[PDB]
Structures are given as structure tokens and as C-alpha cells.
Curated annotation (Swiss-Prot), chain B:
This is Phenylalanine--tRNA ligase beta subunit. Belongs to the phenylalanyl-tRNA synthetase beta subunit family. Type 1 subfamily. The gene is pheT. It comes from Pseudomonas aeruginosa (strain ATCC 15692 / DSM 22644 / CIP 104116 / JCM 14847 / LMG 12228 / 1C / PRS 101 / PAO1). The chain holds residues 477 to 634 of 792 of the full protein. Tetramer of two alpha and two beta subunits. Disulfide bonds: none annotated. It is found in: Cytoplasm.
UniProtKB/Swiss-Prot annotation, chain C:
Belongs to the class-II aminoacyl-tRNA synthetase family. Phe-tRNA synthetase alpha subunit type 1 subfamily. Keywords: Aminoacyl-tRNA synthetase, ATP-binding, Cytoplasm, Ligase, Magnesium, Metal-binding, Nucleotide-binding, Protein biosynthesis. Mg(2+) binds at residue 139. It catalyses: tRNA(Phe) + L-phenylalanine + ATP = L-phenylalanyl-tRNA(Phe) + AMP + diphosphate + H(+). Tetramer of two alpha and two beta subunits. Its cofactor is Mg(2+). Its EC number is 6.1.1.20. The gene is pheS. The lineage of its organism: Bacteria, Pseudomonadati, Pseudomonadota, Gammaproteobacteria, Pseudomonadales. It is found in: Cytoplasm. GO terms for cellular component: cytoplasm. Binds 2 magnesium ions per tetramer. This is Phenylalanine--tRNA ligase alpha subunit. It comes from Pseudomonas aeruginosa (strain ATCC 15692 / DSM 22644 / CIP 104116 / JCM 14847 / LMG 12228 / 1C / PRS 101 / PAO1). GO terms for biological process: phenylalanyl-tRNA aminoacylation.
Amino acid sequence: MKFSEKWLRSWANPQVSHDELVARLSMVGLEVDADLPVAGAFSGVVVGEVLSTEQHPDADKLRVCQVSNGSETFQVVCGAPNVRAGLKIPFAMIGAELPDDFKIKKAKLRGVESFGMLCSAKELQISEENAGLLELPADAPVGQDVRTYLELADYTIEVGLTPNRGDCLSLAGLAREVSAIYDVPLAPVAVDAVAAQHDETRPVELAAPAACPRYLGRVIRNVDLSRPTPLWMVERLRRSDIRSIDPVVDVTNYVMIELGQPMHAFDLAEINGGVRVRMAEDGEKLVLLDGQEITLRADTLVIADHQRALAIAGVMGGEHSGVSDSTRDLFLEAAFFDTIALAGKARSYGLHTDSSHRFERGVDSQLARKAMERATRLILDIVGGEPGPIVEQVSEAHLPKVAPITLRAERVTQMLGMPLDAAEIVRLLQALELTVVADGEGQWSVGVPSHRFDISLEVDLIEELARLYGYNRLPVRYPQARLAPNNKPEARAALPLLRRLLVARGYQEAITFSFIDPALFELFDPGTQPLTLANPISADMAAMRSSLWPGLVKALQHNLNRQQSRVRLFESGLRFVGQLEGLKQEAMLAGAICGKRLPEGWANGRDGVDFFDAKADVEAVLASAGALGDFSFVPGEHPALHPGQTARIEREGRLVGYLGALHPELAKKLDLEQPVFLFELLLAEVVDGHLPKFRELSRFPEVRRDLALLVDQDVPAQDILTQIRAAAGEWLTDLRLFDVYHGKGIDPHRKSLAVGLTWQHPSRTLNDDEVNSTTQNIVTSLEERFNATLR
Amino acid sequence: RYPQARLAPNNKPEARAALPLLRRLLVARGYQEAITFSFIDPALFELFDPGTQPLTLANPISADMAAMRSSLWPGLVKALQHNLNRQQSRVRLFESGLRFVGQLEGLKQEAMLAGAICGKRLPEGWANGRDGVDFFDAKADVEAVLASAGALGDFSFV
Amino acid sequence: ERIEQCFSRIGYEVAEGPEVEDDYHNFEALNIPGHHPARAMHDTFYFNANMLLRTHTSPVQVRTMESQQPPIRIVCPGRVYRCDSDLTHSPMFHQVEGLLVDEGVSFADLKGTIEEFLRAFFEKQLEVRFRPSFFPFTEPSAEVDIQCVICQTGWLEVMGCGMVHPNVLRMSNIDPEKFQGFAFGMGAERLAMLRYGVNDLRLFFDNDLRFLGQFR
Amino acid sequence: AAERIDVTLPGRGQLSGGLHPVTRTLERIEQCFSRIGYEVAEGPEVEDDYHNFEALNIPGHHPARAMHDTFYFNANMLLRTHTSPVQVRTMESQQPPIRIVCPGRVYRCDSDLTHSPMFHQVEGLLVDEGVSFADLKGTIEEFLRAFFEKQLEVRFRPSFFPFTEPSAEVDIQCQTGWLEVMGCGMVHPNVLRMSNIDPEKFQGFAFGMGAERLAMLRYGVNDLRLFFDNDLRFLGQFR
């Protein structure tokens, strides 16, 4: 909602500066988005009248004018194509200071004297019109300052209204606010009734009184549509961002922007047997004034006649029914349309109008009559004609009614944190035109005015009191809390903890989009149907991720393509598994690494990262809540990972996730020339750990024995170690794998595993005989299970 | 009953390396936390702090617990050798606590973070180098701690 | 993390929920009716007629209000999805949304909370301004401004809040006659940009190491 | 042809160490309170007889002040017997409300096998305009439930402390199936009076618990001497 400050001040003048007014507005819930002056500065420019024009005797493109300023006639030479006798135009006198430091001096143009200058809107910075001189009205006052006449000492204010303040979508609504805010007298436009010059009317039928409980119609005969819209109206609309189109639309727009009542005029000739306000029939077709051919639904209210639909009620008029060049007679319309009945209807046909907006947001249900009289006067003054009587069709039972609200002083005090005086409460609410009446001690009954559609509850009243008193003026308190000590279980690896671990372990945290390209999804998750969006932003953002890997791999290559060689990233977030019926939204921790194992340094090995570097990062995360033993890495396969270097991570047979090298075929497809190691973990399976259970320390030394073991190259080292613990006895305190050999020294289908076995008895020393007896039974067990041999 | 409290949101500054944070870093960086007695043997004190008069107790529990520590190093070195003498070869320890500097008139009680390391650089494993820990391994642990609140540049090793 | 800490220190619990929500928890239960323009496909990402990608973290507050009876002190951090994206807006962003429901909660209580949170977060004794605004789920509501101390009138809109609307409580079986409440919301990326001096919102989702490495 | 296959072999490099069981316990206690508005308060380990005794309603002739129980440097300077002097320093520096938790090293002379000459304790304090014994009972009962992660039975028995009145010894279930875990009580008026806090207007409660005691119950530790020995065979059990 944009408006002229001068126009608003003519109704309610707050008696403060422009800056003060623009400040207070945003501070009360009417946020000013823009405050611009209407024109550039200048002095000495007055309304002048061209008395005569002669052809310049020594220059064909020039004219020699005799111009009066109401006090004296001056000779002024002028080259404007539109300069002619009887023209009321801006006359810049000698001495006059025009925009961008332009001083008017005496001139002798081609041997002819000139005592001033005639101006165009551009030269005065009024408009961009430089085609010719600014032709002022025929009735303009000669001698009057052009700034005074054109009311150029003004600003335009743009307010970004909240959907609950549909009442401020007019100068009437906005002026009522200023009067409330500043406790200043409100001087509204006095709208006198226009007496009927004849008795010609058109019948009106309310076939859907629930959607339209009031409709006003008036016949206006023999209108001259060739006649122009006056400057004051054009300027007032222009200052509210409304383009002048034709007198009739300009009036119905002006009335809507002045009072807040959207209005419409039909060519009387186009109305076949009076108005029928009814719901549209399913598949009813209407061509709008813009040419759009709409196919209507039964839930839409239309303004029709006895033959066809004429317009979509409260939103837009039809082509056929509207005003044309042939139009001689009008039929004005001013109505109340129910907000509920109209809600979203314009949008459902892909439409949005100043009328649709206002009716949806709420138009004062009593206003139709005042607006109809206002539009009638303006129409007669602009295009002439003879007014008929007003036809008012109204359904009292369907008219909007808001039950009186009981406001309690205790509740105002409670909510505001401070008590307000009864006189203050009353004065404030009465300014908003609310009907406050005492209802015992510290309680009132308040009635809602016809323009407010947002007030119905006690809280809405308290809101208004808060708003007008001042939000920043209100007290500050900290809420009371009956708090008891509490804490989450000790043995748990929370995500904030796991993140900090990875940071310490040399990782950079990444955040990627949850919606990825379906082709990318398919690469990491083949044959899986992604959860696809109905309205994606683009096609490459249509699939909900089932893994954080695609997004991480992408961020990794984004960096690789940006002169980065060592990329170490991690992300936490949801994966989306399955379709809506059965959809799983599971929190994942994923990581991706490539490049050298260590950063570039004098003391650091130049070796590249491998599977076992990522495995240690995973091991560290799985050990975070003292439950590393509950996890097992088992040889696996994943469509996105290298089948020779893939580990399936499990806890009690349940899947935790995967750890492996990115599949070389996938790297090829993504143009990655480097080995990349990935891991993804179900956080739900990682969080729970175990609380320390103390086991008594022995006062006796530990015994260590080393075993070099030859086994099949393909037998997993974990299976061997598991079988060792199984045979090692109850005293084994530690078992370490310190070397793996696969070379020239032994058979090429075999491997030597160097294991260190540590034992400690809790109550005595261990003898060599028993320790050697244990060692031998461990060996015998490995000879029978994996056909192991000693090196 | 549970007491009533008119509480307001609050938080400590963002750019700060608090001790709980520094501890967890060292844990992640392969350290074991130690807690040693603040009162140490005067002979031990003198070894690490020569010429310095310790703040001595009038009634110590024993003579080897008569001097207030001016450094956490004696206590850490001791815990390190306690383990070394108990079949441990790789000892990585850290402690936080007060140091006591000067006599009662002018006594400074300052919170210190100390660490002590010995043995192989890495634990015994198939994929790990059998190299022993050196000065630059400890330097990295220090560097990591000094970088904790984005102010590593403010520090200089001279 | 920092926002969560300002509240978790004074009895607030961190609340989480699904990113793929239903129109009841996301809209209906938050006093957003069927015809409301926010519900439209121009602003909300949909899967079908009922299932969507959450526009805010407030549905977690609903799930909490349905599961338990007051007191309620929760903070809802998380990824949220808006359709209408450009350069100044991302189709995915993070926000923290708070809720307090107890037997005697005032607007002064909300004002106090917000003012002390912004001072704690921005680590300054900055000036905090409250302006009347509209939200369907809160009444009365406000837009919160802070000075241009952390760099047109030297005021910056940083968060929104308001007193929980009675219908919101009523819908989630909480009696508004007995219980009162306040809610607030703030943009994670917005706050991160003010604090760290980040100009381009697109830097966050690009994950360039030359950018990321600046927050060590 | 991608025969770059490998195993279930342990990862490369260093893994995480751990924290001391006492540090885990201190951290955990602090968290139960810091979540509900309590500030962590710290002070010096070498204190004066005023903050350590006089200000805590312990008079000159009191047996606790003697050299048989307290470590001294001279007549006025000593090693703190409790973390309560931090509460004094707080009460002197500020006016209520006060919600502080005081974790720290404390020193007792009379040591043996069941007692250490150095140990840790957390001591809490709440000072406000309407604090009751019901408030204290509620706080303690909910703290022990949170800490021990069980809905255990909490018993309060009348006891004596010079700085609190009325006072209690707090028991929890598991020879009578009850275990003395902490002490508490309402702050004595003379304590407040001495630190310029009017007892007519302000009331308060204080509590204390042994860090090693709690750590032993939680983790199943038998010997108190294990904590200060720092054996890796012990420490490594709390990773």
C-alpha cells in the first residue's frame, strides 16, 4: 500500500515531521518499505497563460510567445512543438532556480528578446515527459507557484501490510490509524448522497447471499467517455502506483484507494435483464477483460445477468460486460463479498487484483453505500450523466457479526507485565473505533467495528493495547522455572562429541543439499526408486538422498577441481529410505577422504591415504562410548564401493554401515583420477556404549610369547585372532598383530601373521610350562581350523 | 519442592579454548589423563626447580609429601616411571592443575596443563612404523592445543 | 551449537523431528488454514497432497505439545526447505525455533529472553528493538532488531517471535486459560553471516576449503 | 581384473586415550547443575583460616582446625579441607541470587587406606529470597537419580555440620542396603550474616559429595589408592 503523505494528512495530521511519522509507523506494525519525495526542488516557477504565438522571423523551429503570469505579460521565445495560445503551462521567470543548479536569465534568441522560460515535466523533474511543455489544466490559477498547485511538497509512503490489516488498504484505513496512534482528530471526506435525476434501475438478485450479503447497483445514463480524468485524481492514483487508464476505471480505482471499497462499472447495454449474483456452474466459461478464457468451478461466485456470467465476483470483470468506445450508459456496482467465500479463489485461476486482495483481506461490510455515492459524484463531475436511484439488495441473516468480547484488566496486566489505567485502556480501544462498555469491576464488553476482520478474541484486544502503548516501552522480565537437576546417560557417543573427534582427527565438516540429481542417486543407489519431489526447484535437485556420499564425493571433486590435493570431509544428516508409505528418515554420519595420508611437511611421509587410514577414523568413532568390541568389520560389497576393498560394519548382526574405497568405475564416471575412501554410519547404532566396570589389577608380572603364523592369503586376520582368544585361556590380557608378510620368503598363496600374546594371572606368577602348554594348544587349534604352520 | 528460578539466556565467548575441550583433544590425540598429588618430595622439587624455595608444609603426612609443586612435571615423570617399572613401554600422559609459585607473601596459584610422553611414536601394529617418539611428536600435540581457539599465529616457539 | 548452548544452560531441551512432514504438523496445527498462500506449491516443496518438506522447525514443537503436558522448554534446530529460492535465499537452510509453555508466561518474559539471548550470542550489550508483526501461530507477534554494531537506520532484523496463539495450544490439547507460552525463530546462516562477516549465502553449500578452513 | 583386494586388518596409527575416572565424575556432576542455571566456581587450593574456617562457622577451639586434621604452612595459611571457601569468596564478591558448584582438590591430614591426604569434591550453593528444606530435598533427590541414572530410593538422616542448620546425611539403596553418598543442609544464618547476606530476607542450601566416593560406586572401584597411582592397566579401563 503506497500513498501521498499530503493526502493522508488532509484526513489525520499527526503534527510531527515526515521522518517522525515514517519512524512511528514501523514501530506500530505498519512497516514503511519506501519513503520518496514526489519531485525535484525549484523556485520561481508559476502558472502562466499563453496569450498569443507568432512564427519567429529568423528561425522556423521557434515561436515568439506573449505569456501572462496574472500580474504582467512577458515576451518568451519557445521551441516546443505544443506551444500555442490559451495554454496554461509552468512559466519559469527570470531569476528562477530550476533543478541541478539551473538559473533562468534574460535571453536574446536569434535577435528576439525572451523574459523567462516555459517548462516540460522533465526540466522541472516532475516526470520524464520532455516531448514538449507540461500542459496544465484549462482551469489552472495564473500566478500560483507550480509547487503549490501541483502539490510537489510531498512524499510517497509505501507500507508492507500484514494480512490481518486489510482495513489499511485505503487512505481511510491508514488515516484512522494515524488518528489512533497520535490521538489526533480524524477529518474524513464528507460524502453527501447524490439525488436521483431519474427512476431507471436494474433488478438485482442475491442467489448466493452467504457469499454476497450486500450488493448495490446504480444506473448512470448518457456519459461522455471522451472526457479526461482530472489531474488531481491522476496524481493521487499515480502517488499510490495506480496508472491512469480511462475515467470510469480511474474513478472506481480512486474510490477503492480512498475509501477501501473496490467498485466496478458495466456497460448498461451489456446487462440482459438485471444482475444475478450467483455461484458459477461447473464448466462455465468466461473471457476476462484481459482476454484470459477461464473455465469455472461451482465454488466460485460470479456476477451474472439473466443470460450469462459477466465477471468473477470481487476479482475481475469480463470482456463483453465492461466499458468500450460505444458505451453511453453505465451500471455501477459496490458490494460486500464474504472473505471465507473468496479466500484463495483468485489464485486458483492464476489471478490477483487490487479488488481480489481487498475482499479476501476484508472490505468494511457497511461501506458500499458511501462508496456508491462517492463514485456517482465523481463520475458526474468527470464524464457527466444522469444518476438513477440506488438499488440495495441485502441479506441481514448473512451479514458478518462479531460477538462482543469480554476484556479483563487482569489479563492485560498478566500479558504486558504491567497494569494499564482503565481510562488509558478505554481511550486507546475507542480510537480504533471499538465499543468499550464496563461489565463490572476490572472487566469490559467490547464490540468490533465493521472494517476490522482480525479482532474477535481477548488476546487480539490485548495485542492492540500493546501495539499502541509501545512494544519497546513495555517491561522486561525473565520467565520463572521450577528446575530439577538432570543429565543424559554417561555411556553415550552423541553427534557433537563425534564431530569434535573427527575435527581432532584432521577432518573438515561439510553441509550438502538433501535433494540431489536422480542420475547421481542412481550411481550410488542403483535400482532404488528415490523419494522424488512433485515441485523441485530444478531437475538436478529432485531426489531425496539415501546416502550422504553423493553430496560428499561432489564437494570433494569441487575442491579437487580447485587446486586441492588432500580433501578430508565429513557430514551428518538424514537419509531418506523408501517411498512415503514406509519412509525411513535416519540420521547418518558420513566421511570422505583422498590425497596424501599426512599434510605436506619436512617430518611427514609422502605416502597416500589408503583403506586402513579411513578404518582408524571409523575405529575411533566406534570406540567413543567404550563399545568398540560390539562392532565387527566383515568383508562386504556395495554398488558404490570397490568389491575388493569393502567392509560391512555390524553390531549384534544389525547393519551399522559401510567403509570402503569408492568404486573405480564410479570415479571414471565422475572424472576422479584419485583413490577416495568413504564411510557412512547409522548414528542410532553408534550412540549407545557401555559404562566402565572395574576389573582388579594383578600384583604379578605379565608373560608375552610371539607366534609367526603361515595361513592362506585369503583367510581374514580377524578370524585367526578370534580363534586365538578362543584357545588362549582365561589369563590372556592382550593380543596384538604387529606384522603381516606376503613376499619371497614364503609361498605366494600364503601369508605370515606375527602376533604377540600377553598373559597375566590375577593372584600369582605364570610358569613357562603352562604358558608353553597354552601356546601349543592355540597352535594345534589353528592347525586344525586354518591349516596354520609356524615360520 | 524444586526451587523457582527467573533464568536468562547466557553463554561464555565463542573464541576460547576451555580446559574440558583441551582434555578431549589430547584424548583424541592418544593421551591418558593422570591426577598426581600437589605435594611432592623436596628433593624431587629441587631437581626440576633448582634454587627455588618450595612452599613447605608445617605438618606434612610424610617427608616425601612436604613441598607444594611449582610444576606438574615431577609428578608426571614419576607416574611415567611407575608404569615403565610395571612392564609399560609406551607412556603418554597429561595432567591439569595448580602450580604454587613463591612464599605465602606473594604466592601465585596458576592453573597448568602438562604432558609427558615416551616409547614408540605409534602403538604396536601391522601398519605402524616402529620409530620411537621424538621432540616433534610432542610439538604437534602442543601445536594442536595452541590452535584450539583459532590463535596459533599468536604463539612462537623460540 | 552456540544458540543451543544459550538455552540448554537454563533448562531448555534440544528437540528434533523429521524433515519430511505432513500438512497437519507443518501447517494446520500451527494455525495455517487450507487457503493460506504459504501452503501453495510456489513456497512449499511437496511429495503428494499431505506429505511435504518442512518450511520451518515449528512442527517439532507440535509433536512435543502432543506428546507431553507443560512445562515445555525446547529448542528446535534443523534443516528447513523453502521453494522460492534466488541469490539472497537458499532452497535449504537451517533455523533454531524455541518454545516455552508454563503457567504464568508474559510478553515481558519473552522480551527478556530474546534480549538476553542476542546479547549472549553476539557477546555485546547491544540495543534490542521489538516491532509489531504478524504470524498465524503467535499473537501478539514481533520482528526483532539489533544495532549495526556487528556491521537504513542502523537496525537489523535478526529474529521473529511472539506469544503462542490460544488456538495453537487448544489444538494440541493445552488449556490456554491455565497455560501461556512464547515462541521464537532465527536463521542459522543469517546469524553466521553477521557474526563471521560472510557476504554470499552460497558459500555455505559450496564447501570450498578456502572458505571452510577460515572457521578452524 | 581389480585384484587390489585386502582384509579386516586393524586401522593405521594412533587411537584415543582417555580421561581419569574422577574427571568423568566431576564433569558429570557439574552437568546435572550447569543445565539448570548453576555456574562452575573455582578458587585457590592454599587458603586462609578465615575463608576455610571462621567464615564457615568453625570457631578457634574446633577440633577440625587442629594440625591432626588440617595441613598448615603457618598460623593463618593452610591447604583447604573443603571447597566451601570458594562459596565464601562468591558470597563476599556478589549479592543473591547465587547458584554455584565448586569442584576441586581438597586436603585432609588424617589419611590411611580408606582415606587419601588429597581428594576431590563438588560443593554446591543456592542463595535466594524463598529457599526451603523441601527445595533442598527435591534438588538432592533429583541429582542422585540423574547421576546414578536410576529412580533409586533417597533417604535423609539428621546430622551436624557447623556451616549448615538443619543438616542431613543422604543415603541411596544397594549392610542395611543403604549407602551414605552426600551431605547437605540449609545455610546457617551466621554464615550468611558474616558474608553480608541478610538471613531475614535470604535463605540458602548447600551440599557436598566426594568425587572418588561417587566414582567408586559408579565404576566398581575397590581401592581408593588406584586413583593417584595412575597405572595404565587401571586408567585404560575408563576409555
